[PDB]
Design a protein around this ligand. Structure first.
Ligand SMILES: NC(=O)C1=CN([C@@H]2O[C@H](COP(=O)(O)OP(=O)(O)OC[C@H]3O[C@@H](n4cnc5c(N)ncnc54)[C@H](OP(=O)(O)O)[C@@H]3O)[C@@H](O)[C@H]2O)C=CC1
Ligand SMILES: NC(=O)C1=CN([C@@H]2O[C@H](COP(=O)(O)OP(=O)(O)OC[C@H]3O[C@@H](n4cnc5c(N)ncnc54)[C@H](OP(=O)(O)O)[C@@H]3O)[C@@H](O)[C@H]2O)C=CC1
Ligand SMILES: NC(=O)C1=CN([C@@H]2O[C@H](COP(=O)(O)OP(=O)(O)OC[C@H]3O[C@@H](n4cnc5c(N)ncnc54)[C@H](OP(=O)(O)O)[C@@H]3O)[C@@H](O)[C@H]2O)C=CC1
Ligand SMILES: Nc1nc2c(ncn2[C@@H]2O[C@H](COP(=O)(O)OP(=O)(O)OP(=O)(O)O)[C@@H](O)[C@H]2O)c(=O)[nH]1
Ligand SMILES: Nc1nc2c(ncn2[C@@H]2O[C@H](COP(=O)(O)OP(=O)(O)OP(=O)(O)O)[C@@H](O)[C@H]2O)c(=O)[nH]1
Ligand SMILES: Nc1nc2c(ncn2[C@@H]2O[C@H](COP(=O)(O)OP(=O)(O)OP(=O)(O)O)[C@@H](O)[C@H]2O)c(=O)[nH]1
Ligand SMILES: Nc1nc2c(ncn2[C@@H]2O[C@H](COP(=O)(O)OP(=O)(O)OP(=O)(O)O)[C@@H](O)[C@H]2O)c(=O)[nH]1
Ligand SMILES: O=C1Nc2ccc(I)cc2/C1=C\c1cc(Br)c(O)c(Br)c1
Ligand SMILES: O=C1Nc2ccc(I)cc2/C1=C\c1cc(Br)c(O)c(Br)c1
Ligand SMILES: O=C1Nc2ccc(I)cc2/C1=C\c1cc(Br)c(O)c(Br)c1
Ligand SMILES: O=C1Nc2ccc(I)cc2/C1=C\c1cc(Br)c(O)c(Br)c1
Ligand SMILES: N[C@@H](CCC(=O)O)C(=O)O
Ligand SMILES: N[C@@H](CCC(=O)O)C(=O)O
Ligand SMILES: N[C@@H](CCC(=O)O)C(=O)O
Lengths: 501, 501, 501, 125
């Protein structure tokens, strides 16, 4: 909670949707399959948009757990399923005292739009358990996640084909592990796809390579796509590339840490890092790795030797790129005019209110929207889910076959040339480059995850760019993004007797 | 109605619970099976009470329906399951613009406590669809109930063993029929007990005799039990019996109409009847039957020839008994001091606020609580559910056998006497009385429903009376009732996964 | 065999496990994720190893079958499921009077360790029906396998995602066919993956290319990997390669016949073949093909014209390689000192006791362990299971696309060179080699089965070699193998469904 | 069924884990269900264990089964148990004995008088 300008998270998102819906409404009536074309078409389009906006299902739970002391404690949880236009609903689980019905629904709706933007065939969903993880033992957290799983499973809120959870705030591999085990040990004990019931699992329990760093990596790609445009960078008056760029990230968890690791890898330097207790700062930069070790060692960043405890909001720090990677509504009407940064990389979901958004546009600040920028998580979660359904690790059945084929292919040009140039040319060795040598056997799980995500982030970046052009949206990439998501979802709703006369 | 006595229906009920919980807390620690008796027992009791109070599950739905005009309309619905300490959850479905999450949860919790009071083995549940039935065609209402059914069925909110709905405001045999048919035609097409998925069904579709009039009949019995006590009636300064009693009922639907029919049958006379558009009045009384015909004929009571359009609130009319049989919170702090009547027969759920309750006690008004008085509905719904599971109509297999047995039994005393008194006594015909002649073949479906409900209402009336004595609750029958319900529900948690650390 | 050495097959295997477990215990505490590092970690490792060793489930059955004569006969069968750390349990079915609970459990545990060694995602299982196939008509064997299938299916011991059987002693395509049909015709009649319930099926019933010869082929590869090391071959004082090697195989069934076919293909010559009735012998070698025809013709090898009925144990024959491909414990303390051969290729499961193992090491005999050497069966069974789940024969959707692509790729270097060297160089035809021409369309089912198995056997061979180095195990490849299997199974328990941190 | 442990050497928390886990393993292999196999108490088990068993089955595999609680007997009366189930065996022992102890024919061969009134007995357990 802010104080002033702290919109109902759900209505806030509903606003972004509307903003984009009014922009594409014409094109939706344009290519609308109605026979009786007469602006009633315009009404049928509106009728469909009113279906998409609200969540279809919201399950509120209140269940008891036994503390390690012996006392019983009632704990509350929620799971919202926003859309089912794509069968398996998808969305993580958040553990924090801030979860409520409205937050879970806003987040659930962000999931469907983000999946749509990045072409992941999932309807959006989201869960939250209203507790503060820090105040519970590991034994208690397990009871909590496992019991929550059972309650969702009995009401149809988790299943490989109905709804697949994943991590979020204060949850990770560990919780995903308990969730999978509980589902597989009970309701899905006969299901050949029982372990595809949740993603973000540990690699040993059926998880996929780089899922933990997938979001930060996607953040790196999302930024990379726009930071090399020149066109956009000129409006912001910056030079393309990361090499001479500074950035500050609010959040040092799964998203922030890794976003930081990746930008730093490409020359950019982190001038500031923030957390709930405070922020640290250094104009000469901070190394993500020694900061991680200090965090793992002291349970905090404050007091890190090679930086100073910054005083005065990480969000207003001086930098080129600001990466809010914590919770929602961190950027509001009251602090927007003081952000300093030129690019806001939305790693978190809903970090800026529609009011800061207005201010940001007017100050010529580029805000790379969350429904695109942080989609790296679901994109790789989707690859994990796919891996579970296929029951083989990528390339296992083809490494040798491809390897031999590539050598015989190269041998084909070698023999063709030598026979064409005879003994006058001698042997003409056609050998793999060092680079191709690394790819001689074909893609591994890691290859697909890396190349697949890059492909996805770049492809979606283009569509967002192409749409912002067609509608002259300038630096309003958020509106361009929702236009794209709406176009896609609307599509499943229109086609033939699905919804028309 | 009201302005400043609109407490949250849910917190309101939670208050009643607490009121009773503090009264029985001692006895719950008394017969508590803890080994380590040391007021931590008192804490374990509190721990259990905190589990019972909140609803375990609440499903919120938002689904689209196609109007008869062609346009799509999103409609909202809810289904709360308060407790599962008794496997099949039980509760009706309300169609009104007043439904919301809090109303459905309050009503759901009233269901478990009422079932407990009247010994029906069901956990409480309740559904509400936020629409105004009058503004919809029958074709549209069907689409609505059927689609609502499918959405609940897929999330585990309807099933013979999980959750069994029934009628409530603006729903009846018809909706229950669509609900059963939808469930049976799909998810339960292989279930031998598919039709036990919902109660209040038409008798031709597996419904039970007198289910529609069961609530009014239970209202009659609930009142009858206290109106013949003398002890209670003296504190109220009234004579026992209905013969010289006047009453007014707010609500002329399934509950009110029949409550009216029954009281009138036993001499009491209805001086007033109310509805949403207004009320009618007649000191000499109103005949339930000619009023029903006028209602069926003109869609309203206003303008009924044999009564005058009363002017000025049905609740403040002059009578001995006031039967609120409409919606919740009709009796508040502002109109309580003007009720006139001595007995408030709570036919509806939650008709009086805790404030009116206080005023009512002080003015020596007896309020027969809803969780007891209107339990006639679930009691017979339970009989219906039982009938569906047994697949036979009551007595079908035994009518003839019992008939013959009774005659041979009577013949046994006849022959014994004649042989003992020889030809000196002649034939000594032992024949059934007129009354016994009606029962010679044993109970039919109708017999069980009538005798079973009477047995239930009377047995629960005694327990409420016995508890009000033991705790000196005077005319606070509501607190006595919750004490009874709590004692019972508590008793399942006490030995659930059992205790002894 | 032996009296002084005929250990309890299950304990025997449990010993091998322990032998390897003590060797890796340090590394398991090394990379152990416990926070509280203090040798209690060492205890947590031991706690996990004690979980892995015993079978989780063992089902014993006693069921009646009607003989062709008319009489009823009770027959006994067992199915042990050793581990479920990998969802689908995997393991064949043995028909022999030697099956018992302890044998089935030892075999079941060998399955998990072998799958682990060769990276097949299956928990180990094994079934045995205590009968002598020869004493039953085909009609009776069918009743037996089909009824055995139903009994396992009803208790959760067969299903595409719970437990997938395959052939073993005295069972093959035929039994696997009856098994699949029975499962699919009943319990799995609605399951899209019903036919993945069992492997080793006939190719027409959903089986996979080369599954029958897969084990012998894997035996060939397992041997090939070590027979070309020089390092190992020097310790044994032999020259690498098969070209000048003699071998004798005990067993002429699915494993022995094909192991023989393959070694013979690469120059090695079979000097002896054994069976239950006796053995044949020829210093100049025996042709696998004319021996198969004689066997198929006379139901035995004894009396084969081109060889002499050897007199005196096939296991003590004079050769370089001894391939025991029959039943367990054929090599014991009493005959080990007389094996003659330098390499023992364990085609069968458990052919040598821990005592012969000791003797074998001391005499510098290399024993290529069964959990690696015969893993060719499950490896290809896994490919079959995968094929059933994918519902397409390999390459069907891509043969043409790949073919065209390869020619356009080749055309790309051709046109690039011709345009670069103009009419001065003429046409520079870039054509596929003969070899590449065979691969121009990409891999077929047969290609994957062959290249996939080779890849697997070679990859596992390396890991076994790398581990034997790291722990200086010399020719104790068996201990190296168990170390690898344990490392893998323990990884799964490391993060595990629980969390201990 | 039998679980090879000595109840006395385990806390109540541990016994629960044990019975509940045992239930799940049996349920997944078809060894407990209202229509397949219904357990009950025996040596070192009673209402309590039967309660954990029912709850585990009902909370999981039988969550939709209208007869989920008929999966086990000897349950506490509050959890769906029946009157006098605990004393039912001893009561049946009384009846079984009563039937023969009043035969005269049998009691004469044993040279005893019918009835319990003048009889002594010792029970092991
Ligand atoms: N797979 C995923 O987890 C994905 C996450 N995301 C996005 O990233 C965010 C999730 O981060 P995860 O949930 O990944 O983060 P994790 O909980 O690890 O994040 C931990 C960090 O969040 C910080 N934080 C929380 N609140 C504040 C605050 N008010 N001010 C400063 N720092 C704060 C924490 O500080 P402290 O430790 O003191 O609480 C800590 O540094 C989400 O909002 C979501 O939209 C998007 C896609 C995928
Ligand atoms: N089986 C059952 O139905 C049971 C019902 N109950 C209780 O009784 C109530 C249900 O009545 P049902 O729902 O049975 O009634 P039905 O809809 O028939 O009741 C119809 C009557 O209610 C009147 N009414 C509604 N609101 C008001 C109001 N604000 N003021 C005056 N009259 C009003 C209607 O007038 P109009 O048509 O103009 O709106 C109409 O005459 C419930 O609240 C429930 O708690 C308890 C147990 C069982
Ligand atoms: N896919 C697979 O089938 C795999 C099998 N294996 C291993 O191979 C063995 C299975 O062979 P299958 O079961 O494949 O073989 P099949 O039954 O065909 O083997 C038949 C041959 O084994 C001979 N034989 C059996 N027992 C003895 C004995 N005690 N002494 C001498 N000769 C004997 C038989 O002679 P006769 O007919 O007169 O009895 C017969 O010629 C198993 O132990 C298993 O561990 C391992 C991995 C994969
Ligand atoms: N938290 C953290 N994780 C790391 C670090 N280095 C690597 N990883 C993690 O695991 C990778 C371990 O990766 P490898 O297989 O060597 O990774 P890679 O594909 O070259 O990794 P890229 O480095 O992902 O970022 C990432 O997915 C990270 O989640 C680190 O310094 N800190
Ligand atoms: N709405 C309404 N229903 C009535 C009336 N009288 C009887 N019923 C019916 O009670 C019916 C069948 O009643 P029997 O004929 O079986 O009824 P009953 O047992 O004599 O009814 P009671 O006298 O109230 O006990 C149901 O089908 C109701 O429709 C009435 O005056 N109005
Ligand atoms: N036992 C046996 N099986 C054979 C023989 N010839 C062919 N087969 C069977 O089918 C193969 C038919 O194989 P082809 O397509 O010609 O085999 P390859 O040419 O692909 O076969 P391999 O050399 O065994 O890899 C094997 O899988 C056998 O099961 C034979 O002489 N004996
Ligand atoms: N262990 C034990 N159980 C008893 C004893 N007395 C009664 N029970 C109980 O039998 C109970 C209820 O018994 P009642 O209805 O009062 O027994 P009766 O009065 O029907 O009992 P009996 O005289 O034994 O036939 C169960 O809850 C058992 O605990 C007793 O002295 N010892
Ligand atoms: O299936 C399960 N395996 C488990 C291992 C450890 C623990 I702690 C719980 C489980 C589990 C199921 C489970 C199921 C429910 Br219903 C529940 O409330 C809890 Br607590 C656990
Ligand atoms: O199973 C069903 N039988 C029906 C008969 C008439 C009608 I109108 C609907 C049904 C029905 C299922 C049904 C299911 C869903 Br889904 C739905 O939105 C609607 Br309209 C109906
Ligand atoms: O499901 C089944 N399909 C069959 C086809 C032919 C035959 I012979 C048997 C089956 C069969 C099931 C089956 C099941 C059991 Br019981 C049994 O004892 C047998 Br003889 C057969
Ligand atoms: O369904 C279940 N409800 C529970 C409540 C408390 C506890 I401790 C366990 C359960 C439970 C299921 C359960 C299931 C499994 Br499989 C298991 O190993 C354990 Br331990 C528990
Ligand atoms: N909880 C994350 C990811 C959801 C998912 O991976 O399914 C948000 O976004
Ligand atoms: N809806 C009513 C009746 C519920 C029922 O009979 O199940 C309440 O009370
Ligand atoms: N009996 C073989 C069968 C392989 C399989 O289960 O596929 C083992 O080893």
């Amino acid at each position: 909670a802010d104080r002033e300008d702290d919109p109902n998270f759900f209505k806030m998102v509903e606003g972004f949707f509307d903003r984009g819906a009014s922009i594409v409404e014409d094109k939706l009536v344009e290519d609308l399959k109605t026979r009786e074309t007469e602006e009633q078409k315009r009404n049928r389009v509106r009728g469909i948009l009113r279906i998409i906006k609200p969540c279809n299902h919201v399950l509120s739970l209140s269940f008891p757990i036994r503390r390690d002391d012996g006392s019983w404690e009632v704990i509350e949880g929620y799971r919202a399923q926003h859309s089912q236009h794509r069968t398996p609903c998808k969305g993580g689980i958040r553990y924090s005292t801030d979860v409520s019905v409205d937050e879970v629904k806003a987040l659930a709706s962000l999931m469907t739009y983000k999946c749509a933007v990045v072409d992941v065939p999932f309807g959006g969903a989201k869960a939250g358990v209203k507790i503060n993880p820090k105040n519970y033992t590991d034994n208690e957290l397990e009871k909590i996640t496992r019991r929550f799983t059972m309650e969702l499973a009995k009401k149809g809120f988790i299943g490989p084909g109905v709804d697949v959870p994943a991590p979020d705030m204060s949850t990770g591999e560990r919780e995903m592990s308990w969730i999978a085990d509980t589902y597989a040990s009970t309701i899905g004990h006969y299901d050949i796809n029982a372990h595809a019931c949740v993603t973000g699992k540990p690699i040993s329990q059926g998880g996929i390579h780089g899922r933990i760093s997938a979001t930060g990596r996607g953040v790196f790609h999302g930024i990379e796509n726009f930071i090399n445009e020149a066109s956009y960078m000129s409006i912001l008056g910056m030079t393309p590339g990361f090499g001479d760029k500074t950035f500050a990230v609010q959040g040092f968890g799964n998203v922030g840490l890794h976003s930081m690791r990746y930008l730093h890898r490409f020359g950019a330097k982190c001038v500031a890092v923030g957390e709930s207790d405070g922020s640290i700062w250094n104009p000469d930069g901070i190394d993500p790795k020694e900061l991680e070790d200090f965090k793992l060692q002291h349970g905090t960043i404050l007091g890190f030797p090679k930086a100073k405890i910054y005083e005065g909001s990480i969000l207003e720090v001086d930098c080129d790129i600001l990466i809010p990677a914590a919770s929602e509504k961190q950027l509001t009407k009251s602090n927007a005019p003081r952000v300093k940064a030129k690019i806001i990389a939305e790693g978190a979901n809903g970090p800026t209110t529609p009011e800061a958004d207005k201010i940001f546009l007017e100050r010529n600040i580029m805000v790379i929207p969350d429904l695109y920028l942080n989609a790296g998580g679901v994109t790789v979660s989707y690859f994990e889910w796919l891996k579970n359904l296929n029951h083989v690790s990528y390339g296992r059945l083809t490494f040798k076959y491809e390897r031999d084929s590539n050598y015989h292919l190269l041998m084909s040009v070698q023999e063709s040339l030598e026979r064409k140039f005879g003994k006058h040319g001698g042997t003409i060795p056609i050998v793999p480059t060092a680079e191709f040598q690394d790819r001689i056997s074909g893609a591994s799980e890691k290859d697909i995850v890396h190349s697949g995500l890059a492909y996805t982030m770049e492809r979606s970046a283009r569509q967002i760019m192409r749409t912002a052009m067609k509608y002259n949206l300038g630096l309003d990439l958020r509106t361009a993004a929702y236009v794209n998501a709406i176009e896609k979802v609307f599509r499943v709703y229109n086609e033939a007797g699905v919804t028309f006369t």
